[PDB]
PDB file of all heavy atoms in Angstrom:
ATOM      1  N   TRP C 100     219.451 191.974  24.624  1.00  0.00           N
ATOM      2  CA  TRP C 100     219.086 190.968  25.629  1.00  0.00           C
ATOM      3  C   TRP C 100     219.242 189.550  25.080  1.00  0.00           C
ATOM      4  O   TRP C 100     218.958 189.307  23.903  1.00  0.00           O
ATOM      5  CB  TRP C 100     217.632 191.178  26.087  1.00  0.00           C
ATOM      6  CG  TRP C 100     217.076 190.037  26.901  1.00  0.00           C
ATOM      7  CD1 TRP C 100     216.043 189.186  26.567  1.00  0.00           C
ATOM      8  CD2 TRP C 100     217.547 189.611  28.167  1.00  0.00           C
ATOM      9  NE1 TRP C 100     215.845 188.263  27.567  1.00  0.00           N
ATOM     10  CE2 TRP C 100     216.755 188.502  28.564  1.00  0.00           C
ATOM     11  CE3 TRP C 100     218.569 190.059  29.017  1.00  0.00           C
ATOM     12  CZ2 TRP C 100     216.955 187.837  29.782  1.00  0.00           C
ATOM     13  CZ3 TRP C 100     218.770 189.400  30.228  1.00  0.00           C
ATOM     14  CH2 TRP C 100     217.965 188.296  30.598  1.00  0.00           C
ATOM     15  N   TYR C 101     219.707 188.631  25.925  1.00  0.00           N
ATOM     16  CA  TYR C 101     219.728 187.197  25.598  1.00  0.00           C
ATOM     17  C   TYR C 101     219.529 186.384  26.875  1.00  0.00           C
ATOM     18  O   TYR C 101     220.275 186.571  27.834  1.00  0.00           O
ATOM     19  CB  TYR C 101     221.043 186.812  24.918  1.00  0.00           C
ATOM     20  CG  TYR C 101     221.082 185.394  24.372  1.00  0.00           C
ATOM     21  CD1 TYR C 101     220.794 185.126  23.032  1.00  0.00           C
ATOM     22  CD2 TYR C 101     221.410 184.318  25.202  1.00  0.00           C
ATOM     23  CE1 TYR C 101     220.834 183.827  22.538  1.00  0.00           C
ATOM     24  CE2 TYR C 101     221.451 183.017  24.718  1.00  0.00           C
ATOM     25  CZ  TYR C 101     221.164 182.771  23.390  1.00  0.00           C
ATOM     26  OH  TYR C 101     221.209 181.471  22.928  1.00  0.00           O
ATOM     27  N   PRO C 102     218.546 185.460  26.877  1.00  0.00           N
ATOM     28  CA  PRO C 102     218.038 184.894  28.126  1.00  0.00           C
ATOM     29  C   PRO C 102     219.034 184.028  28.884  1.00  0.00           C
ATOM     30  O   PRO C 102     219.731 183.211  28.279  1.00  0.00           O
ATOM     31  CB  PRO C 102     216.852 184.044  27.662  1.00  0.00           C
ATOM     32  CG  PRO C 102     217.236 183.612  26.296  1.00  0.00           C
ATOM     33  CD  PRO C 102     217.932 184.803  25.707  1.00  0.00           C
ATOM     34  N   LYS C 103     219.093 184.231  30.199  1.00  0.00           N
ATOM     35  CA  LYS C 103     219.825 183.344  31.090  1.00  0.00           C
ATOM     36  C   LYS C 103     218.897 182.206  31.497  1.00  0.00           C
ATOM     37  O   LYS C 103     217.729 182.448  31.811  1.00  0.00           O
ATOM     38  CB  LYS C 103     220.305 184.096  32.328  1.00  0.00           C
ATOM     39  CG  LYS C 103     221.193 185.284  32.007  1.00  0.00           C
ATOM     40  CD  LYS C 103     222.203 185.544  33.118  1.00  0.00           C
ATOM     41  CE  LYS C 103     222.993 186.820  32.862  1.00  0.00           C
ATOM     42  NZ  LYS C 103     223.803 186.760  31.608  1.00  0.00           N
ATOM     43  N   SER C 104     219.419 180.977  31.489  1.00  0.00           N
ATOM     44  CA  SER C 104     218.657 179.761  31.867  1.00  0.00           C
ATOM     45  C   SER C 104     217.837 179.883  33.159  1.00  0.00           C
ATOM     46  O   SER C 104     216.777 179.272  33.277  1.00  0.00           O
ATOM     47  CB  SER C 104     219.585 178.531  31.927  1.00  0.00           C
ATOM     48  OG  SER C 104     219.523 177.861  33.178  1.00  0.00           O
ATOM     49  N   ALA C 105     218.346 180.666  34.112  1.00  0.00           N
ATOM     50  CA  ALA C 105     217.624 181.030  35.340  1.00  0.00           C
ATOM     51  C   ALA C 105     216.228 181.602  35.098  1.00  0.00           C
ATOM     52  O   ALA C 105     215.328 181.405  35.915  1.00  0.00           O
ATOM     53  CB  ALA C 105     218.444 182.025  36.147  1.00  0.00           C
ATOM     54  N   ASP C 106     216.058 182.322  33.994  1.00  0.00           N
ATOM     55  CA  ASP C 106     214.751 182.839  33.599  1.00  0.00           C
ATOM     56  C   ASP C 106     213.750 181.742  33.198  1.00  0.00           C
ATOM     57  O   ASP C 106     212.744 181.517  33.882  1.00  0.00           O
ATOM     58  CB  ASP C 106     214.907 183.834  32.439  1.00  0.00           C
ATOM     59  CG  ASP C 106     213.577 184.235  31.836  1.00  0.00           C
ATOM     60  OD1 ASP C 106     212.678 184.673  32.589  1.00  0.00           O
ATOM     61  OD2 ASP C 106     213.428 184.094  30.604  1.00  0.00           O
ATOM     62  N   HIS C 107     214.054 181.051  32.103  1.00  0.00           N
ATOM     63  CA  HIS C 107     213.038 180.348  31.299  1.00  0.00           C
ATOM     64  C   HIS C 107     212.750 178.885  31.688  1.00  0.00           C
ATOM     65  O   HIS C 107     212.407 178.079  30.815  1.00  0.00           O
ATOM     66  CB  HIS C 107     213.425 180.436  29.803  1.00  0.00           C
ATOM     67  CG  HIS C 107     214.643 179.641  29.437  1.00  0.00           C
ATOM     68  ND1 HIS C 107     214.601 178.286  29.185  1.00  0.00           N
ATOM     69  CD2 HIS C 107     215.937 180.010  29.292  1.00  0.00           C
ATOM     70  CE1 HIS C 107     215.816 177.854  28.900  1.00  0.00           C
ATOM     71  NE2 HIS C 107     216.645 178.881  28.957  1.00  0.00           N
ATOM     72  N   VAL C 108     212.838 178.540  32.975  1.00  0.00           N
ATOM     73  CA  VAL C 108     212.746 177.122  33.382  1.00  0.00           C
ATOM     74  C   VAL C 108     211.359 176.525  33.103  1.00  0.00           C
ATOM     75  O   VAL C 108     210.364 177.251  33.131  1.00  0.00           O
ATOM     76  CB  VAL C 108     213.183 176.869  34.851  1.00  0.00           C
ATOM     77  CG1 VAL C 108     214.542 177.497  35.138  1.00  0.00           C
ATOM     78  CG2 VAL C 108     212.122 177.337  35.834  1.00  0.00           C
ATOM     79  N   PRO C 109     211.295 175.206  32.830  1.00  0.00           N
ATOM     80  CA  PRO C 109     210.069 174.604  32.285  1.00  0.00           C
ATOM     81  C   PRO C 109     208.849 174.560  33.229  1.00  0.00           C
ATOM     82  O   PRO C 109     207.714 174.470  32.751  1.00  0.00           O
ATOM     83  CB  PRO C 109     210.517 173.179  31.917  1.00  0.00           C
ATOM     84  CG  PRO C 109     212.011 173.181  31.999  1.00  0.00           C
ATOM     85  CD  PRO C 109     212.323 174.176  33.062  1.00  0.00           C
ATOM     86  N   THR C 110     209.088 174.601  34.541  1.00  0.00           N
ATOM     87  CA  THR C 110     208.021 174.718  35.551  1.00  0.00           C
ATOM     88  C   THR C 110     207.307 176.072  35.484  1.00  0.00           C
ATOM     89  O   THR C 110     206.079 176.139  35.549  1.00  0.00           O
ATOM     90  CB  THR C 110     208.596 174.523  36.971  1.00  0.00           C
ATOM     91  OG1 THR C 110     209.082 173.183  37.101  1.00  0.00           O
ATOM     92  CG2 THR C 110     207.546 174.787  38.053  1.00  0.00           C
ATOM     93  N   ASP C 111     208.089 177.136  35.336  1.00  0.00           N
ATOM     94  CA  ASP C 111     207.567 178.505  35.309  1.00  0.00           C
ATOM     95  C   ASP C 111     206.750 178.836  34.065  1.00  0.00           C
ATOM     96  O   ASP C 111     206.097 179.880  34.019  1.00  0.00           O
ATOM     97  CB  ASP C 111     208.717 179.515  35.383  1.00  0.00           C
ATOM     98  CG  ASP C 111     209.607 179.313  36.598  1.00  0.00           C
ATOM     99  OD1 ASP C 111     209.405 178.323  37.339  1.00  0.00           O
ATOM    100  OD2 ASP C 111     210.530 180.137  36.791  1.00  0.00           O
TER     101      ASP C 111
END
Side-chain angles (χ1 to χ4, degrees):
Chain C
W100 168 245
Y101 188 96
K103 302 210 186 298
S104 125
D106 171 53
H107 69 82
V108 309
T110 295
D111 304 6

